[PDB]
Design a protein around this ligand. Structure first.
Ligand SMILES: N[C@@H](CCC(=O)N[C@@H](CS)C(=O)NCC(=O)O)C(=O)O
Ligand SMILES: N[C@@H](CCC(=O)N[C@@H](CS)C(=O)NCC(=O)O)C(=O)O
Lengths: 209, 209
């Protein structure tokens, strides 16, 4: 399979960490230059008409949305289902956390930072408050819990690691969210794809310089 | 099980349509008054600390995020898996469309309309353009396709019906998106929960008056 991605991109990094966790290798890895509008070529649009990254191309099957890709990888290539168990309630909790990561947590990241880094607009107080609301919820989810979505490390932890590490490299101070801070330091240690993720975070950090 | 919801709410309506499709009855249905901040009671926060609707409470298991609830209902209570097949590639396509519905399509709805209806702010041109971008993508997804996420009617069609019907009742003109318009008229006919959804849309419409 071919992965179309950028190393700096959080949704790409969640996919990369998942592949590492599963021992999956991508036979082709292609960095898409979005500045050069490489995602708008007729060839790319034929694979993914939404012209987004990450995009996976697996023997004529095309897939996008990072969190859809993460579940697909576990279901198709996982030697076990530990990261996304077949148990309906376990899966549902992980799914809720994945939608939270997209719709609340990472959404707060992009809505606060993207206008500054890409449109040179001033920092917005209301958008910052939404980050804080999102971290408060995550901090609550993690109260008395080692992992973010059940008794075991799961896809939710990978997704949150990609997002929270982006906040980290952006300089968002989350020290006061004690459960988040504790979860984060622990999860790093359990994630074989952590180096690669943090290296990508360093690439993303260039947008601030 | 108990459903906490509002009839006007699109993510609630997607859950309601799913229950109808599956022949699922909720033993308790509770309308949450969000104006009266009923979601902030200690009792509600104990079930769902994110204080959102829809929330499902199923024998001590609490679940939120509409699209997580939709999959949970099919997996736990479905007499078959037609709406969310076990096939890994079929599921992945439906999952991508569900994330699209949350992160692109319904996101464009709330970001354009909510500031007007709730904060009395003026209509924003950039936010309207994002609606159009989202409908263009959906129109492309539907090119030569009867349904939105595979050869059969699925959870993706239910999710999109909840979202597109909200656009409809809000007065967003999507006639020019020929595939969307065609898909919409057809999908209504195949959806046993359509009346209830459209009735909820009428309740939501009161925010414009
Ligand atoms: N919700 C998507 C987000 C993907 C996304 O918006 N990727 C960005 C880069 S971080 C992108 O492809 N932008 C280029 C474009 O849309 O044309 C996911 O989780 O995969
Ligand atoms: N992404 C969520 C959205 C749920 C949501 O934001 N619901 C609104 C009503 S439409 C709500 O509970 N607002 C009250 C609050 O958050 O306090 C889903 O799909 O279920």
């Amino acid at each position: 399979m071919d992965l179309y991605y950028r190393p700096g991109s959080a949704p790409c990094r969640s996919v990369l960490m998942t592949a590492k966790a599963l021992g999956v290798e991508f036979d082709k890895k292609t960095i898409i230059n979005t500045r050069a509008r490489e995602q708008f070529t007729p060839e790319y649009l034929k694979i993914n008409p939404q012209h987004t990254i990450p995009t996976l191309h697996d023997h004529g099957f095309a897939l996008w949305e990072s969190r859809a890709i993460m579940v697909y990888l576990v279901e198709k290539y996982g030697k076990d289902d530990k990261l996304f168990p077949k148990d309906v309630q376990k899966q549902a909790l992980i799914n809720q956390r994945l939608y939270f990561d997209m719709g609340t947590l990472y959404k707060s990241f992009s809505e606060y930072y993207y206008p500054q880094i890409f449109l040179k607009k001033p920092a917005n107080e209301e958008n910052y408050k939404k980050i804080e609301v999102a971290f408060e919820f995550l901090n609550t989810f993690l109260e008395g819990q080692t992992y973010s979505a059940g008794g075991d490390y799961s896809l939710a932890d990978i997704a949150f690691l990609a997002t929270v590490s982006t906040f980290d490299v952006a300089g968002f101070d989350f020290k006061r969210y004690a459960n988040v801070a504790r979860w984060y330091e622990n999860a790093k240690k359990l994630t074989p794809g952590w180096e690669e993720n943090w290296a990508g975070c360093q690439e993303f950090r260039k947008y601030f310089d």
